[PDB]
Design a protein around this ligand. Structure first.
Ligand SMILES: Cc1cc(NC(=O)Nc2cc(S(N)(=O)=O)cc([N+](=O)[O-])c2O)ccc1F
Ligand SMILES: [Zn+2]
Length: 257
């Protein structure tokens, strides 16, 4: 089906998923001079000390680490959110060159990659119900810039050889997602959508201001993954990002002056 290619990429998605042309699509460009400081926003509360990672898998568009979401073990709350959201998975978007790869942009600046931690609202009981609701999901977005290595990322980097091709997975227990956070939790927030099909408009986006640094050797290993399955022609998994969409009738809010 869909992908990031010339013949099946984001400009084609509306044919199968007409909400692609909807009123609250993501990602967007964050224009820092038009964002509104909102003093009523609360600090984010990230409680990941009890997180239980399970598996790591190549799904043909990205790779994801999945977590046990059967209890409140790793939760996100506060900020613009009402209620408790459980961590389900995280994944990345990255580019073929260091000057591209993020989905959100800041004053039109692209970062080398973007990390998405996907959480769902526990009032809805299961994630399938949550994606049907306007406040069903909260995705925490973190920008990656190339510089010094991020020690907390290396354990992800070292297992990617074992999930090179579409459909491969591997046990990936005891991974602590706190190692992927920047120092500051200052953020922008806006109502948006999933950035992959089905592009459901169910996401409160929380995009952190401070990027994390990763080394050139770390991001190079992202670029060695494959879109294709084993035994097919090799296409490198790169540029798996959706370009910015129209903001339309939305306000981006900032948690900081
Ligand atoms: C109908 C339905 C869809 C989903 N899909 C989903 O949650 N996440 C997902 C999100 C993004 S993103 N960029 O929107 O956060 C990127 C990737 N990916 O690229 O692998 C993902 O696999 C989950 C439950 C559900 F019932
Ligand atoms: Zn994503």
């Amino acid at each position: 089906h869909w992908g990031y290619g010339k013949h099946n990429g984001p400009e084609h998605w509306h044919k199968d998923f007409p909400i692609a042309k909807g009123e609250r699509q993501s990602p967007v460009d964050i224009d820092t001079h038009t964002a509104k400081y909102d003093p009523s926003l609360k600090p984010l509360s990230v409680s990941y000390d009890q997180a239980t990672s399970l598996r790591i898998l190549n799904n043909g568009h990205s790779f994801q680490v999945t977590f046990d979401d059967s209890q409140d073990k790793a939760v996100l709350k506060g900020g613009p959110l009402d209620g408790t959201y459980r961590l389900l998975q995280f994944h990345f978007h990255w580019g073929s060159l260091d000057g591209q790869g993020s989905e959100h942009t800041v004053d039109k600046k692209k970062y080398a990659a973007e990390l998405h931690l996907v959480h769902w609202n526990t009032k809805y009981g299961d994630v399938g119900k949550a994606v049907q609701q306007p406040d069903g999901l909260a995705v925490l977005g973190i920008f990656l810039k190339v510089g010094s290595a991020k020690p907390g990322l290396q354990k992800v980097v070292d297992v990617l050889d074992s999930i090179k091709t579409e459909g491969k997975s591997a046990d990936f227990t005891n991974f602590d997602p706190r190692g992927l956070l920047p120092e500051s939790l200052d953020y922008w927030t806006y109502p948006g959508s999933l950035t992959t099909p089905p592009l459901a408009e169910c996401v409160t986006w929380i995009v952190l201001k401070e990027p994390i640094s990763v080394s050139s050797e770390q991001v190079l290993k992202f670029r060695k993954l494959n879109f294709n399955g084993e035994g097919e022609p090799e296409e490198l998994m790169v540029d798996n990002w959706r370009p910015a969409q129209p903001l339309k009738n939305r306000q981006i809010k900032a948690s900081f002056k």
